[PDB]
Design a protein around this nucleic acid. Structure first.
Lengths: 77, 151
RNA sequence: GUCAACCGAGCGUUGAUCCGAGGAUGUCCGAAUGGGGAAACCCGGCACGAGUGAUGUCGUGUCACCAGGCGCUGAAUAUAUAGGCGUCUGGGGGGAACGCGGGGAAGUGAAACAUCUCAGUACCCGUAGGAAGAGAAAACAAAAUGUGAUUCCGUGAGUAGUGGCGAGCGAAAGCGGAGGAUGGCUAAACCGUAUGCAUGUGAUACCGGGUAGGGGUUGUGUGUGCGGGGUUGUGGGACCUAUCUU
RNA sequence: GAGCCCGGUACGUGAAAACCCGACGUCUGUCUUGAUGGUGUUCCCGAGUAGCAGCGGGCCCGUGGAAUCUGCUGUGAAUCUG
RNA sequence: UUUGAAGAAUGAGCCUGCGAGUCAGGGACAUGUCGCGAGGUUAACCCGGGUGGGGUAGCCGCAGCGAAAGCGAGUCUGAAUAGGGCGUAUCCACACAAGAGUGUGUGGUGUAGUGGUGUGUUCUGGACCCGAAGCGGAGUGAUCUACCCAUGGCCAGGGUGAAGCGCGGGUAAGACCGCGUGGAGGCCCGAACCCACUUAGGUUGAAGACUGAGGGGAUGAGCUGUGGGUAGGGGUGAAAGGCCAA
RNA sequence: ACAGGCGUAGUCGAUGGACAACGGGUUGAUAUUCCCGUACCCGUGUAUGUGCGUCCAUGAUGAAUCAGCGGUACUAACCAUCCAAAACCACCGUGACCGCACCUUUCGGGGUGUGGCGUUGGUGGGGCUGCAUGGGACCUUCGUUGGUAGUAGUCAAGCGAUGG
RNA sequence: CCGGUGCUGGAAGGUUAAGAGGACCCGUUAACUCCCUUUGGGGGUGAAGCGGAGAAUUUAAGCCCCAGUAAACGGCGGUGGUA
RNA sequence: CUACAACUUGGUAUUGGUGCUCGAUACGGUUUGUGUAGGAUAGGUGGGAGACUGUGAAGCUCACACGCCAGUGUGGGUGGAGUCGUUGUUGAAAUACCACUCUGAUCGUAUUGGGCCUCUAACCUCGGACCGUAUAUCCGGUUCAGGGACAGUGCCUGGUGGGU
RNA sequence: GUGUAAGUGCACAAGGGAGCUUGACUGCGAGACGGACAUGUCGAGCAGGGACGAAAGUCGGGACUAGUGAUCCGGCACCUCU
């Protein structure tokens, strides 16, 4: 995928099941979405690819904080 | 989402109240309008609620209030406080819109919005005296006469 | 130089041929990078210089892409932004193995076979380094008054065990050793700070008491960036508060 | 078929320049305005995390009574009688 | 190799050279030999120009029975010394009991394992050698052939005579009829060209799929050229399980 | 997931489009290529002259007003319409309701037509206040013209698109 | 020809996952009441809490079921006797 | 036979507001305790010597209704001092006041839920217009219009499934 | 005739009948058969505690041979094992 942006919750690769096994993965994706937000600092609307988890992070942590944390990682937002 | 209301709303209460509501309501409707505030801290939330309430009450305007502010925008010279280097004639840091509007607060009276201030047309960071204009109305806009504190 | 002779013409005691380290020159293709291209071949721009009666021509340089920093502008549109223009530094690809993270089979064995095994091997990817990774206890142990970062080797052990309890897989603790740095640096409470979004007790508060001018070291908030203080386990630390006070 | 012919060995010599080791003096900081201990209570000790549930990986361990380590979702706590 | 091959069962043209039970590992079992002997021996490692010295962590023996606790020359089961199972190197000498097959208590004789090495078999590894069809991963290939796209070119020559149009008859007006023009057609005969039906030959060929004489289509669902695209469980296919570099 | 898949600007790509040469001779070997002759298409200089317009200014336009005639027309307010605010009179099966004679187990409960305020209710017309409408103008004023102000400015050698 | 299989439609029912629930019990034990020799060992009740497997109940599609559909796959019979 | 893709169902995060309707949970006054002695459905139960009335009560017709239809409590209104005190019968006493409150049916209040009618602010728009842009059926951004807590995506789950 | 196929046996009855009744037990087992191996078959005799019988003595299923299925993995009751 375009890859998460605030955390880095990438995929994973499972395998087997019950009822006798069979070996066979099925990526365990993450739940990213395309929520947008508003930066009152620079007067702008930003769209991101963020999981619901990361939305939780935002609403109990801020957006400025998050973009600074992403600036660190230098994601091409 | 534990948040402190700023205005009155259906089935919540009135301004100043404290409510535990649904997360998305508080996420999408209230909080990104400056109509509420998170409840994280006692005095922090208290001060933010008080100040936001005063500012929301004081920010209003109508078309005729714009027609009157179009006349009252020719105020006296509203000066601006500065820390910079007068060595070469360049300013250390760009000066806010809050500073200009609080100068108007303590000189002329109107406590306007930082948003509509055409500070770009001011071109701060050249030491001198910058003119200014503001989106008061759709069509009507008036001008202010300004000066700077020499550094 | 040579396979590799032949011929011709020469140099060398004024130190040749030869050997070593550094420099210079370094056509064209190639990450290839001015644009283009069937790889090594076609066309140009800009500044300067050479050249013709002028044009053509020639020479020296430089012009790609992105990431970041700085600088100018801030389109719809108001704030202002994406973007645009200039400059500065990086990266770009190759490599024989060795490494770490991720993906990831099958023939085979099971006298068939799917679970299992072959193997997390081959191979593929992304990035490295001269080595890598791990690494300072939210660990082991068993009432012994014990050990004291990690890694790699020997043993424990083909054992305890696991397993269509079938084929087969398979430790660790502990013990002896190599090497020793039983290593260091931070965040938070708390202050001093620049600030930045807010407001206005507009005052008995900003500080060492007190003698006090002010009348706000903004009055009180709140995160930000800087500086101190603080780095622990038998708990420590910041407030507090006595004592000697190198 | 060579100890005494030749090349060379045992052995001792040798570097203007460049490169690598330390050695130094520069240069750079850094503690110095300090410490040892006392004493009774408030505050802090790394949060979308640890934990629990659902699918999965790998650990001697094939879901089994199955800890510890972990990946994705969902939910989601306290600071030392922790 | 076969019950049985001189065998009309296979293999070998001839010579010369090359070509198949191997190695690892303190692995396992059995057995020779050597050192030690109720003891035996070291591993990693350290020091050693060398093959040598050290290194006690470990392993094998020295007591077993029992699922286990646990007990101990006895122990387990069991209510039981009441029989049995396993064990107490073995033999030797005296006793008591029975001859249901011998046992039980004494005394002495006193227990032999381990580490190197050689041989044989054996376990894990390609495991005496050669031999598949075929499974999987990553890539190369549409210059042949299948289809499509873009753009050009080629189809001698001779016949038939549709629609329409005109004139005339006919009409009340038409429909209808004749003469002419026009010159359509997945039309006709036939070369180039594209195919390939029969037949003869060729069949260690002229040819790794052809030739001779005849044959089908031959203005169209055409043939062909230049450039290009689709790629492997996938393509493409006027579909035969055909074609995708003999 | 990463590798990489698509793809706009753009850039490459003829098998096509546009673009200027024909004949003869020559060597042992080349030839619309060299030679002979006659032609053509790009650009480039020097000079010759016919007309040239910038400067002179030669002609030829508009701005746009102070404003006058009549007329969109916040409009002070006027020509015609209904309905119902409170609502006017006439009457009609009335929630409680005041209430003639009687059905009715012999009676505490099941009713009827005329009768009365109320008119939870129903029909008809007239003084009626709110209403907006089309018509003509006044303020604003937009349409028609005298001075003016084609005066100061403006178009006029050319080349002229990377656009239509 | 609508029985069998399939397609479309419609849910009165029966079976029906996950999830939400968490009755009742079983582990552990703060605290008591007896047993005994004595240097507290062995028995019972055993609060809340933390845990274990957990029911009752509410649960959709589907399936069973009700009709239609064959230019939809498909299927189309015998003995006897009488002129 | 086992399994996977793809499709599909539901729960859940994204993902919310108001209204109505249908459930049970708890704070709350409430309907309601037929054993004979007998006014006799005797609410069991702990203080217990008057009993609430008059901040307007018997018997009462009627608004009401259950119904174990003998009977039950309730209210417009007269009534204006009435039943009653262990009334005595008893395991048990009033159904006197006060009350821990259970086998009950009703109903306010926090809820916990679902379904339905809707708003928009998340979200979607290969719908439009403008800009970056000179060129761009791309892409992004603003805005208009619309849809709309549905759909899409993630995680768990059931089903069909020779398509593999 | 012998519960059920056939054979070997049964009159000395193992056939027929009547009374008590649970040995259709527990802990073992000398020596033997048969034997690829695992399986399979009988077994006198000892001990507790019983039945029947007056006692001797017989009874560890049925006149005998068929009537059933290894191992692994789970389930129930009891144990003074962990």
């Amino acid at each position: 995928s375009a890859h998460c942006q605030v955390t880095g919750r990438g995929p994973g690769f499972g395998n087997s099941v019950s009822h006798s096994h069979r070996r066979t993965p099925r990526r365990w994706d993450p739940n990213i979405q395309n929520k947008t937000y508003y930066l009152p600092s620079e007067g702008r609307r930003i769209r991101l690819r963020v999981s619901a988890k990361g939305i939780k992070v935002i609403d109990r942590d801020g957006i400025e904080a998050v973009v600074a944390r992403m600036r660190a990682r230098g994601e091409k937002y | 989402m534990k948040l402190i209301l700023t205005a009155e709303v259906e089935h919540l209460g009135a301004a100043g109240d404290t409510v535990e509501v649904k997360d998305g309501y508080g996420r999408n409707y209230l909080l990104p309008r400056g109509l509420a505030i998170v409840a994280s801290r006692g005095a922090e939330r208290q001060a933010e609620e008080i100040r936001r309430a005063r500012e929301s009450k004081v920010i209003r305007d109508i078309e005729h209030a714009n027609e009157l502010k179009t006349a009252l925008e020719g105020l006296g010279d509203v000066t601006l406080s500065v820390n910079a280097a007068g060595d070469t004639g360049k300013l250390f840091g760009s000066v806010t819109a809050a500073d200009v509007v609080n100068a108007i607060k303590k000189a002329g009276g109107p406590n306007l919005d930082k948003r509509t201030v055409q500070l770009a047309k001011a071109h701060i960071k050249s030491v001198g005296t910058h003119p200014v204009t503001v989106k008061l109305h759709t069509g009507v806009e008036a001008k202010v006469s300004l000066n700077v504190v020499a550094q």
